Ligand binder design. Structure first.
Ligand SMILES: Nc1ncnc2c1ncn2[C@@H]1O[C@H](COP(=O)(O)O)[C@@H](OP(=O)(O)O)[C@H]1O
Length: 212
């Protein structure tokens, strides 16, 4: 069977696309990511149902996945860790000021957009929901967004038994990730460094064009 082994609790802009690539290389995928929501039909509607508080069977989202990182799932780490008690929790972190610059320059413009494109309505509803419930409706307030990031990270660390949680900065490379799961380090392989910008812009254009 396909079993969920890793719940990613880190926010976007903490290297989650790189971690997705790394986990899949280690045989711990398929790994879910924000980008996956655009590749799985029905999944943005499922995530908005989750966001509204509907009863949603998590298997309808994750049955084919062994790991998840990034939004939208990272906001639901607490429920997911109870759903999947044998899964580890992976918290990716980053220094807060640089995290916010990354968030403000890449995600906030997308999340704050108005679009007349019907194909983006489900996505915008979802990231507006995240803006509302995780950020209290404000993305432009630097100190506030940083306070949300730091409290999110702290609440994960306070809530998950220590042996079940890895706190990881992607700048550390393979070694602590591999050691935590007891897997070998891939030889002569740099840790992935995926910017997670242009890939999403391509998925947006594919969705507007109805490609795939
Ligand atoms: N191996 C690595 N070392 C350092 N930063 C990395 C990295 N892999 C990804 N990142 C940074 O993580 C951010 C993307 O994270 P995510 O996939 O969660 O959206 C990007 O930040 P920047 O916007 O500063 O380039 C990317 O540069």
């Amino acid at each position: 069977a396909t079993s969920m082994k890793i719940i990613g609790a880190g926010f976007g802009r903490t290297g989650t696309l790189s971690v997705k690539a790394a986990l899949e290389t280690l045989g711990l995928g398929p790994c879910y990511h924000m980008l996956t929501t655009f590749e799985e039909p029905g999944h943005l509607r499922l995530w908005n149902a989750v966001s509204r508080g509907e009863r949603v069977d998590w298997a309808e989202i994750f049955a084919r996945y062994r790991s998840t990182v990034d939004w939208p799932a990272c906001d639901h780490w607490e429920t997911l860790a109870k759903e999947y008690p044998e899964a580890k929790v992976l918290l990716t972190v980053r220094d807060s000021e640089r995290w916010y610059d990354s968030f403000r320059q890449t995600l906030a413009p997308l999340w704050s957009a108005e679009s007349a494109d019907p194909e983006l309505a489900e996505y915008l509803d979802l990231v507006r929901h995240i803006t509302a419930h995780t950020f209290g409706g404000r993305l432009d307030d630097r100190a506030h967004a940083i306070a949300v990031f730091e409290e999110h990270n702290r609440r994960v660390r306070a809530s998950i038994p220590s042996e079940r949680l890895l706190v990881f900065d992607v700048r550390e490379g393979w070694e602590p990730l591999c050691a935590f799961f007891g897997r070998p380090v891939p030889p002569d392989t740099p840790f992935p460094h995926l910017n997670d910008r242009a890939a999403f812009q391509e998925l947006l254009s594919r969705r507007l064009a109805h490609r795939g």
